[PDB]
Design a protein that fits this description.
The structure is cut from a larger assembly and holds 2 copies of chain A (57 residues), 2 copies of chain C (256 residues), 2 copies of chain E (268 residues), 1 copy of chain G (123 residues) and 1 copy of chain H (178 residues). Chain E has helices at residues 52-56, 87-92; strands spanning 60-68, 75-79, 95-112, 126-132, 154-158, 165-168, 177-178, 203-208, 217-235. Chain E is mainly beta and 268 residues long. Chain E has one domain (1-268). Chain H is 6% helix and 32% strand. Classes of the chains: A mainly beta (57), C mainly beta (256), E mainly beta (268), G mainly beta (123), H mainly beta (178). The complex binds palmitic acid (2 copies). Residues 80, 82, 98, 102, 104, 129, 131, 153-155, 166, 168, 171, 177, 179, 201 of chain F line the site of one palmitic acid (PLM). Chains A, B: This is Capsid protein VP4.
Amino acid sequence: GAQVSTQKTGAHIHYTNINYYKDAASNSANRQDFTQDPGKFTEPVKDIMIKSLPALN
Amino acid sequence: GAQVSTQKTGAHIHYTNINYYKDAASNSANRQDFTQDPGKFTEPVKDIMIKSLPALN
Amino acid sequence: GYSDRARSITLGNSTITTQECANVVVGYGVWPDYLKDSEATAEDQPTQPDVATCRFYTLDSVQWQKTSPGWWWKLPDALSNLGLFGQNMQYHYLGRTGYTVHVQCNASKFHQGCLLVVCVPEAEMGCATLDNTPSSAELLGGDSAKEFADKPVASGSNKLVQRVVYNAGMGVGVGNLTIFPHQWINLRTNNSATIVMPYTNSVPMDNMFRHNNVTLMVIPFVPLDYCPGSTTYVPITVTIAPMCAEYNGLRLAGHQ
Amino acid sequence: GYSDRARSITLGNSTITTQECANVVVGYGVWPDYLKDSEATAEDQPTQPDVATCRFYTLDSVQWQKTSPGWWWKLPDALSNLGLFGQNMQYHYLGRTGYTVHVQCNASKFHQGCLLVVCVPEAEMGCATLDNTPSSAELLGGDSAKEFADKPVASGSNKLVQRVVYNAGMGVGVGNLTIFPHQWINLRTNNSATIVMPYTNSVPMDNMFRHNNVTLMVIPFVPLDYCPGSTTYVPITVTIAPMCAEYNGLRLAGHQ
Amino acid sequence: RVADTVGTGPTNSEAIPALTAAETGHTSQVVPGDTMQTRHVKNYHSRSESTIENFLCRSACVYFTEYENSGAKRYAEWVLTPRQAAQLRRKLEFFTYVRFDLELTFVITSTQQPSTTQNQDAQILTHQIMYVPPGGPVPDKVDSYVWQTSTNPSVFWTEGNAPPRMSIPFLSIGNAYSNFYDGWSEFSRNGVYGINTLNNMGTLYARHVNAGSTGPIKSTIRIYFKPKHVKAWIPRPPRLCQYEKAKNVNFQPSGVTTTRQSITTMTN
Amino acid sequence: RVADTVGTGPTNSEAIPALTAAETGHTSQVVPGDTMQTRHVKNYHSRSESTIENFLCRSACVYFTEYENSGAKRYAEWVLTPRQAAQLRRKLEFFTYVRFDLELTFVITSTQQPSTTQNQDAQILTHQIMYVPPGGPVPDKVDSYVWQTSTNPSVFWTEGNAPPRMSIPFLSIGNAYSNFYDGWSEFSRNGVYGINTLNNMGTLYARHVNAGSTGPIKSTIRIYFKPKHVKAWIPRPPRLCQYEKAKNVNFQPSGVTTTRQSITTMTN
Amino acid sequence: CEVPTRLNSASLKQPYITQNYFPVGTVVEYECRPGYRREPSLSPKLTCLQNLKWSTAVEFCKKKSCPNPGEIRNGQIDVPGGILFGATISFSCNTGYKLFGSTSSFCLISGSSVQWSDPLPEC
Amino acid sequence: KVNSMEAYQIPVRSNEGSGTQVFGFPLQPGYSSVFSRTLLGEILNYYTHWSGSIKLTFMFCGSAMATGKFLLAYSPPGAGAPTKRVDAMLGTHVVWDVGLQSSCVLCIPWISQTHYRYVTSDEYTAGGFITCWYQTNIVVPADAQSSCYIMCFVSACNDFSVRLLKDTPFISQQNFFQ
Ligand SMILES: CCCCCCCCCCCCCCCC(=O)O
Ligand SMILES: CCCCCCCCCCCCCCCC(=O)O
């Protein structure tokens, strides 16, 4: 049950991984979770504020 | 002859295992046998005792 | 055809009309709701007063002078003695409540200033003396506001709270406080601030008396100013409304 | 296969096991429910605590002696200072609640006696003096029982309550009280009495402080008796459980 | 996974889940919902760290002994038993009969004993550990002929590496190991009384294969047991007293628990 | 991958992307193309070294302590905390609640203490590190009975190999670790105030299994933490002051920033 | 047998401390040291075994408890380490009230029991 | 009483009063002296954390002519232990009527703020208080003993669980047992 994944390469290749322990708290740290969502902290207003429009109307 | 099994994960992932020795008294201890049966020690009465009913009738 | 400057909020038997206000801020994008049956831990049936506890409570006002550093309120301990919210909080062991904060300050077109209203979760506060932690009679006073300071509090043998406005009492830059749900009151634009906060914790429920989930701080960044002849008494009023409050663990009254 | 002598009742976080009891009496054939939207009058949204107010409350015991006339409790005023039931009753103006009364008295096979437990609605009580009505400090005492008398109370210039057991304090035969929901405790048969009472009134809701919907009276018809050598202290305990309680009219605390 | 709670409401029935009879020697199967009103809770808690195998599967030091490279004490000998120490013994005597494979580890550490000898220069010490089953020719000396280990299992370990470790099978003539024995070894009801009747697991020996240096060195060997694949039957109450002898269950009488100020005191 | 720029031209419209209202507490989502003319640029730059896991997943020394093979100090004891050092503490207090597995590494180094003893000849030192959760029997001496480690996890390490390392699970009764706590431990609002209320992670002990030599040797153990699988919530502003005590957030007041010659000076 | 085991709560009785010879089968007895009450469940006796070792010894005495520090007026008392023999409680006053007296109060042994030697300050 | 069988007997009797207290102890299944030595407490002392509901079964061991009534109450922390029956009434109680059935079951539920509680003494993971009070009185006939005993049995419910393994603080050793 090997996992083949993609390495970190430059822009402008695969690696293989096997788990040997039965705990799941002992596996290698996940270095590939590129996910962003700034809506929670930036732009937290209840009413949507379109950019081109006047903020106060 | 590799065995793929599930790791220990939290609620709310697989590992691989091969045996190298020919004795079966030399393999890793089994940490995943979650089976319970308290009927032998608790509630050992010959006659079934329904909960809502009076114990002595 | 309306204007987004006026706004009304209805809760229980109370209603608050702003007339001139900025857009409402909603926590971390989350609206306060009840506890789910897949995230619960306590097995007894909770109580939900709904209308008695979830209404607008208006604390006692303070005065915005020209040299006011700022004020702070520990949110669970401010409403401890107010109405049926305080009563249920005493008898029950565990509670869980969201808030709505509505800060009001009005002035004329000739008055100038700027306040920052920030809801800070887990606002642990340092002490003037390094050896000992600050006392409760110092950290939180219900039915009144706690004021910051403009000069560093003298160290020694005491249990005071460091109150420097710039350090915010937490050893952080006051300017960097805009990480938490924050709203700005500009006397030339605004007259009120409204922040809705959900329940934040590492646990599904908690004892309100021994733990403060969030602390509301109002700080005058730009000072108050006016020309001689105009109104010199300008107060600041704070209204808090518990939302989706529920309690578990009915027992004897008191937190002893 | 069971016996109809044992019985358990669960309400809120309280449970009462009788073990040896007669069949439960249910008011006038009606089970207590909430107020319907076709019979309501007050327009604001009611509050329903549900678990905090609807639980078994155990008053302080009394002693059944050989010459005890009897005791009475005004039901709304007995639970006035108990738990969250009393707290909500103070803040709110209107309330509406059903009851469950569980009276307990046990004794050995060698003790004899007979008590009558009667829930009397609108039990207006007369006065020793014809000119004036009885005072509140005389009609109702919470946290304790009020006792009847075996001899007529002396008339004069006072505000006492006529307490003759035979006249029941209402100018009626005590034997004819079996018109209201009643249960009999016979020491050779019973050890407890259970009566469920709905909400009775000429109005959809009412102020609990200024009006008592029902009065619970326990009267020893056949006296207590035993032979020398057996237990001489035999108490009587009363447990009340508010059912489907709801309140309208949240305002300042107190009945002033 | 533990059972999830079921939501319940009020009740005015004849069902009496609370009242029971303890005389029948039956434990009540009552849940909190029988005696109060509850909500629905989904429990993800698991009883995975409560399995008997997981509880007993951890290495524990059962004994340690010392030998030298000079003088009279040149080798060490131990009759194998799991009752020398307190911790694993008490963990194992929760049950009457157990059955497990074993994992054996040794931790050997040398130490230069003080001496007036000069120009000391030691070489790498090598140790030999040997297992002699009952009936074997026990070594009478360090340079004996039995250290050839023709059939007796033996391990050779050079200092400065991962500690030695081997796996042991059940190795019992009985269908299960007994932690308790109520009886004697002779049919005439005299002799050895107790669990010492069934302990015939052999003997262990340890020595230095070389002297290493011209200065005395004392080596200490520690033995670590780990039960694997455990099957247990007939649970028993835990030891209230403190163990005295490994061979016998003899004990000094002790109170049932600790005392407190009063029957209504919430402080120990 | 960062968003690519969009080419823009001149504008004479009523759209006002620049003018906004900061009072609403809303950050503007303006790009450079709103306020000037731009060209089309394709950006291949990635925000891969900015993930919270990558930022916190690096070993850091949290503590170091020393023990000897002679005298009074024969073993070392540390109550586990991540607040003893400055660097990882400040990195971790960017957030209010965190949740991670742990990777633990130890670096142990011995050093011959000066002595008048002669004919010194040491053997390989072996160390034992033991973890005692709250409620365990803490060792009162070096040759105690608790170093048997029946259930307490322990490691044995011989000098001259790769450093020891094990993996730790979340091990928290709370749903997330708290870096800040606003409250007391007693319901009467007195006692321990602050994050010390929730620190009950246990204790760590270290010793020499042998003495090795007839001359005193002092061993130093350094402990390295590495957070793996990290989940963080509620970001907080970075510490402006300098940490004083690990137990309390007490601080000495400091200026908001550094000063410069004038408001129109481009040199610090 | 060698000299009996030393304990942190109990000490040998008068005949045993003087004795230097312990044959097999000898019983020695301990007694609570000052500031330590005796646990009724445990018996303070040690026998000499055949291997010339004493039997397992467990602490036969527990620390004594100083009385409740009480409630000071217009101030608070930290009580950091509890109220057992050898504790140390601290006193303080609110903003505007000056402490007069001692600042701390150690739990020490005064006579046959444990008492707090320092008195309560007034503020 | 610990060097006897008297540690197990709860001594109720007939008194000229109503509302007094029988016993009382805190909910610490593995640390309190009352619970640290039962089977449940002995299993707990090998684990750092615990979670779930508790069963407490009380059996009346008086005469068949004696009759009684009791209040068994659990009160979660936040206020001190109740000192009067009325204060205890406000918690989670059960009224036990001593009839043909000789046993009643008070089930202490899980009302923690966390998911798990520490076995060792910890103010943050407080458990609560368990108390008993005379609901009425123990009424006996003549020529029948008025002093009786109750017995208490402790069990865990089907949602009980334990976590980190540790060494027991009870067993100890100074030399190798030979
Ligand atoms: C160098 C190789 C050495 C091999 C030594 C093997 C020793 C086997 C010991 C078996 C121990 C069995 C313990 C049983 C305990 C019980 O009776 O419950
Ligand atoms: C030889 C084996 C030793 C094992 C030692 C295990 C120690 C576990 C320590 C866990 C530290 C958890 C830190 C949490 C920090 C926080 O509260 O944010």
